[PDB]
């Protein structure tokens, strides 16, 4: 409806993304001549973002899913943001058949609210991702939702991406077939920056 002739498939903004299925012909890979950090760093310039990009990831060494679940629960106890309106605007007020002078109690107000909040907040977990030799830097920090539980009462809903931002990184592009004429160019790589409870 945007383009009249639909002679190409259109792109979509749904996240998250599977990474490129890349072809293993070695012509496409960049070789050590221009795999030198210094020119790479200057060509990318201000796009460089060391909180999100790297030649060698912190995430390394010196089951782990129960750990994801425990991380997630901790992160939900200190939700960022402002309390959402839909929760903040909750006075547990009308009780005796659509009211009392106070079905609950002031105190219990905010506490019920903070519980609703932690129960329905959806944190972004981060993890380093290996994009492969055709990108540089090759490792990028990527966001994700925790979706092994429900974020609603009652149960049904699940955390999913709700905002995204783009990292700018570099790609080893070969113009001609067989990977003749290669070079690095800025490319926009999307990452999840917010999650929200959703059906």
């Amino acid at each position: 409806m945007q383009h009249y002739l639909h002679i190409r498939p259109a792109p979509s903004d749904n996240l998250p993304l599977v990474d490129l299925i890349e072809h293993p012909d070695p012509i496409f890979d960049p070789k050590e001549k221009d795999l030198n950090e210094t020119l790479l760093r200057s060509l990318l310039g201000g796009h460089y973002d060391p909180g999100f990009m790297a030649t060698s990831p912190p995430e390394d060494r010196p089951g782990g899913a129960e750990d994801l679940a425990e991380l997630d629960q901790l992160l939900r106890q200190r939700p960022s943001g402002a309390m959402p309106s839909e929760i903040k605007g909750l006075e547990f007020s009308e009780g005796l058949a659509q009211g009392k002078k106070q079905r609950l109690s002031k105190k219990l107000r905010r506490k019920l609210q903070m519980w609703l909040w932690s129960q329905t907040f959806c944190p972004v977990l981060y993890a380093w991702n290996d994009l492969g030799s055709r990108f540089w830097p090759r490792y990028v920090k990527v966001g994700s939702c925790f979706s092994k539980r429900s974020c609603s009462v009652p149960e049904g809903m699940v955390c999913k991406p709700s905002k995204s931002v783009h990292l700018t990184v570099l790609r080893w592009r070969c113009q001609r077939r067989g990977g003749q004429r290669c070079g690095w160019i800025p490319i926009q790589y999307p990452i999840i920056s917010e999650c929200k409870c959703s059906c």
Binding site: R8, P9, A10, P11, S12, D13, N14, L15, L17, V18, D19, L20, I21, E22, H23, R134, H166, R171, R173, R177, I185, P186, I187, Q188, Y189, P190
Partner: protein
């Protein structure tokens, strides 16, 4: 006679590798170079069985064709499930960007 051989063979999934250079899309899409897309083809004639993944409507239409073929065609073998691939390409502002392209890969076929 001008057609593929698709009479006695029933509705089914087939392979099809699509190369973007062959469609002239190499200056729009820089990766991947192509993808396994598949396609559906085959017959949906009466009677259909459960493996044909037919809608109720396709069952009604198949019986209506059997009985007077001029009144309606037979339903067609079309995809019932597709998946996405991610693709790196130049956009309208000539910026290169990575995104998901939904419904690009056929996963299953059915009578529709």
């Amino acid at each position: 006679e001008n057609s593929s051989s698709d009479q006695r063979q029933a509705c089914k999934k087939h392979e099809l590798y699509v190369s973007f250079r062959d469609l002239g899309w190499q200056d729009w899409i820089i990766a991947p170079e192509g993808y396994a897309a598949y396609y559906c083809e085959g017959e949906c004639a009466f009677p259909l069985n459960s493996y044909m993944n037919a809608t109720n409507h396709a069952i009604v239409q198949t019986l209506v064709h059997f009985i007077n073929p001029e009144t309606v065609p037979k339903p067609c073998c079309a995809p019932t499930q597709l998946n996405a691939i991610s693709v790196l390409y130049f956009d309208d502002s000539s910026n290169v960007i990575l995104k998901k392209y939904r419904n690009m890969v056929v996963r299953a076929c059915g009578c529709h």
